Amino acid sequence: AISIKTPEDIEKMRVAGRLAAEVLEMIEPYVKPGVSTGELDRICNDYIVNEQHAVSACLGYHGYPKSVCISINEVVCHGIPDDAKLLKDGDIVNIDVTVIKDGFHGDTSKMFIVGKPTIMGERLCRITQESLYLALRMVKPGINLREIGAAIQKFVEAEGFSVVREYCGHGIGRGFHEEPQVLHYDSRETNVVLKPGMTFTIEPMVNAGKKEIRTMKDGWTVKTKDRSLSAQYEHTIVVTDNGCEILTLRKDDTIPAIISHDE
Numbered sequence: 001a002i003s004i005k006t007p008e009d010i011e012k013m014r015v016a017g018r019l020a021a022e023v024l025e026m027i028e029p030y031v032k033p034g035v036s037t038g039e040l041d042r043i044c045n046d047y048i049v050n051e052q053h054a055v056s057a058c059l060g061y062h063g064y065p066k067s068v069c070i071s072i073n074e075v076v077c078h079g080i081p082d083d084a085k086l087l088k089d090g091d092i093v094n095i096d097v098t099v100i101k102d103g104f105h106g107d108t109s110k111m112f113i114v115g116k117p118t119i120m121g122e123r124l125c126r127i128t129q130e131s132l133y134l135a136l137r138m139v140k141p142g143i144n145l146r147e148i149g150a151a152i153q154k155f156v157e158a159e160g161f162s163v164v165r166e167y168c169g170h171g172i173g174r175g176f177h178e179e180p181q182v183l184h185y186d187s188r189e190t191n192v193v194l195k196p197g198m199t200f201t202i203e204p205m206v207n208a209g210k211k212e213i214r215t216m217k218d219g220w221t222v223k224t225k226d227r228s229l230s231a232q233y234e235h236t237i238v239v240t241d242n243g244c245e246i247l248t249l250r251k252d253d254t255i256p257a258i259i260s261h262d263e
């Protein structure tokens with residue numbers, strides 16, 4: 001079943017969502033050539049534990065050994081921070097943060113460009129964020145989740161990119177991954193009509209080349225089969241009476257916090 005959050009639950013998710021967003025705001029200035037992904041992870045964990053008094057939902061989860069996921073270039077998702085993996089000028093990097101506070105999860109990710117913005121990968125990142133924003137603008141009671149995945153795929157493909165099929169957004173709350181699965185492509189047989197108080201993520205993974213992926217020697221890391229660049233952005237939301245509220249909004253987002261579809 002998909003749980004409907006109570007008003008108190010939603011308030012706790014506002015807090016957890018803000019904390020996850022804060023991690024991404026904090027880490028940004030550290031993302032520069034020469035830093036290791038292991039160091040970035042250490043800085044994130046320190047902040048989550050010691051400044052936010054929260055805990056990483058990733059660390060220990062199905063044995064995952066780090067506190068955030070950091071995915072560079074052709075890595076699609078679930079890249080494992082490593083002390084020896086150094087960022088280079090021109091890299092694109094996803095950092096994906098999930099924190100638990102007061103029993104509730106907040107889950108969000110964004111892309112960072114290492115160095116100047118006008119590089120191979122910039123347009124991929126921008127379009128990936130735009131695909132997330134397109135989807136967020138659709139969320140309201142009475143829409144079928146089917147429609148949202150179809151819209152993401154149509155947009156991404158019209159931009160000359162492909163959508164990763166094997167990974168999806170998810171319900172979230174007291175649990176990390178709850179019902180429903182939020183597909184980012186058109187699947188005629190879905191699904192699920194949205195209702196106020198549902199909380200879930202949208203997190204499209206978009207490849208510059210072909211859609212196919214390969215899962216690596218470590219039980220987590222996913223790369224593009226063609227080693228083309230891949231980008232992802234993620235937000236956690238709550239469905240409101242006439243739209244949604246974006247719980248993991250950051251200072252650099254360019255979409256409104258609260259989206260309303262009423263006249």
Ligand code: MET
Binds near residue numbers: 064
């Ligand atoms: C190591 S679990 C990482 C999960 C990821 N934060 C997600 O959005 O599902």
Ligand SMILES: [Co+2]
Binds near residue numbers: 096097098108109234
């Ligand atoms: Co995430």
Ligand SMILES: [Co+2]
Binds near residue numbers: 107108169170234
């Ligand atoms: Co997620």
Ligand code: NA
Binds near residue numbers: 071074075094
């Ligand atoms: Na990538």
